Amino acid sequence: PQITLWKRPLVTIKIGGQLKEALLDTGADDTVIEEMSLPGRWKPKMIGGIGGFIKVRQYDQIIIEIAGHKAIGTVLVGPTPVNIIGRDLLTQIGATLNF
Amino acid sequence: PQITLWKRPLVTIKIGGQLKEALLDTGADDTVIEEMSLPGRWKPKMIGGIGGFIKVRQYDQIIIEIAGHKAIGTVLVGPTPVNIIGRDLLTQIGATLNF
Numbered sequence A, B: 001p002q003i004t005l006w007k008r009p010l011v012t013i014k015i016g017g018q019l020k021e022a023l024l025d026t027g028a029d030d031t032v033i034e035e036m037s038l039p040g041r042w043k044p045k046m047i048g049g050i051g052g053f054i055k056v057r058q059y060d061q062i063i064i065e066i067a068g069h070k071a072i073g074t075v076l077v078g079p080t081p082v083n084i085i086g087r088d089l090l091t092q093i094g095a096t097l098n099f
């Protein structure tokens, strides 16, 4: 699809068998999701944003559907204001920015 | 142009007669620029994201040159760690997400 930006580019994602809304974010290196239960072990990761840094839990090889496209990769879980799909997963679904 | 997301989508803009590197951020509602002087009246605003909030100065009807295009709108100025081009200006140059 082609998504204009007059509104926030929010899509439905499926992770852990649950449907959630997430923001397609070209300004994010990684994918960060709100607090939830994911399988396996996690490693620490520090990420930064507009207000500063926060600690998140890094889970690798997590299966996640983004707007109907399946992706398998790293998902960071933590106190993020909104679920964001970063470049790591946007590249897996073949997303490009055009103008 | 079609911009792949293997690396951060950075662009050079010209604002206030100054050339600046900026990040095309679909996850950003507004355009936020590092401290600089802009003409006219402004109003304080608090913007948030990963790490919390920062207080910025809001200037309206500011012209920015981006990728040959000369767009106009609201620009927020403050202690942002990265110059961010948000949806407010990305819409004006007709930027869309495609996959």
Ligand SMILES: CCCC[C@@H](CN[C@@H](CCCC)C(=O)N[C@@H](CCC(N)=O)C(=O)N[C@@H](CCCNC(N)=[NH2+])C(N)=O)NC(=O)[C@@H](NC(=O)[C@@H](NC(C)=O)[C@@H](C)O)[C@@H](C)CC
Binding pocket: A025, A027, A028, A029, A030, A031, A032, A046, A047, A048, A049, A050, A080, A081, A082, A084, A086, B023, B025, B027, B028, B029, B030, B031, B032, B046, B047, B048, B049, B050, B081, B082, B084, B086
């Ligand atoms: C979570 C909130 C929604 C997404 C977020 C993404 N912003 C980018 C901006 C670029 C950095 C300042 C970001 O935080 N990217 C992070 C996301 C986390 C991540 N790990 O991917 C990132 O790439 N961080 C890198 C570091 C980038 C450093 N870059 C650099 N030094 N040049 C990282 N690996 O930690 N948008 C925002 O922060 C914007 N906020 C908004 O759009 C609105 N706020 C909300 C909560 O919707 C508005 C009402 O304030 C800001 C710019 C104001 C308009």
